Amino acid sequence: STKKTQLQLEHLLLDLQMILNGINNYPKLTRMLTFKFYMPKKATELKHLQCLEEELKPLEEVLNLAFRPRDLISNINVIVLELKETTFMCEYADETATIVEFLNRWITFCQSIISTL
Ligand SMILES: CC(C)C[C@@H](NC(=N)N)C(=O)NCC(=O)N1CCC(c2cc(-c3ccc(OCc4ccc(C(=O)O)o4)c(Cl)c3Cl)nn2C)CC1
């Protein structure tokens, strides 16, 4: 059970990393930063993945406007939902962020959980 959680988080880490790498390869990059995302106040536990889940449709939107995007987010949606049974109301920070800041924060979040086992 613990190994399946570690490999799920690693798969989530790769997918977010795959998006961020393609974003840096793009004038076009400046236009992609106008798209704003809601961010968590503090992401420490696995329960906070509800903040990412809520922002997956907005993530699909920006990838469509730029990158199949519908197939990629569908895979992320399953993994996130499988990783988090518990109803947790998510808390969003006062400041919104760009696509680059959104991805990097969740990449760092994923790297924190893998380290805590
Ligand atoms: C209040 C806000 C936090 C709520 C938020 N929802 C949420 N995250 N929960 C939301 O709705 N945000 C959406 C948003 O921020 N938008 C503003 C930007 C909009 C937008 C961007 C582009 C867009 C256009 C063009 C683009 O690039 C193509 C291109 C080709 C070449 C060049 C160039 O030379 O610059 O530009 C790209 Cl990457 C994008 Cl993202 N199209 N539109 C309408 C979408 C809505």
Instruction: Give the domain ranges of the chain.
Output: 1-117
Contact between residue 39 and residue 69 where contact means Cβ atoms under 8 Å apart: no
Cα angle value 116/1/9 (rounded, 5°): 50
Q: Whose CA is closest to 82, among 115, 102, 52?
A: 52
Please, where are the H alpha helices in the chain? 2-24, 28-32, 50-54, 56-65, 69-83, 99-115
Q: Looking at this protein, which amino acid is placed at residue 70?
A: R
Q: Whose CA is closest to 71, among 56, 81, 82?
A: 56
User: Experimentally, how was this structure solved?
Assistant: X-ray
CA dihedral for 67, 72, 73, 76, sign (positive or negative): negative
3-state percent breakdown (helix, strand, coil) of the chain, nearest 5: 70, 5, 30
Contact between residue 51 and residue 39 where contact means Cβ atoms under 8 Å apart: yes
Give the whole-angstrom CA distance, residue 45 versus residue 67.
Answer: 31
Residue 32 CB less than 6 A away from ligand 1: yes
CA dihedral for 108, 113, 114, 117, sign (positive or negative): positive
86 φ, ψ to 5°?
A: -130, 130
The DSSP call for residue 34 is: T
The CATH architecture assigned to 1-117 reads Up-down Bundle (1.20)
Q: Whose CA is closest to 91, among 26, 28, 18, 40?
A: 40
Contact between residue 51 and residue 40 where contact means Cβ atoms under 8 Å apart: yes
Atom of ligand 1 nearest to the CA of 29: 38
Give the whole-angstrom CA distance, residue 91 versus residue 102.
Answer: 15
- Substitution site in 23, 55, 62 for ligand 1 pocket (most atoms within 8 Å of beta carbon): 62
| All residues at 6 or more sequence positions from 95 whose CB lies less than 8 Å from its CB, including other chains | 39
Angle between helices 2-24 and 69-83 (to 10 degrees): 150
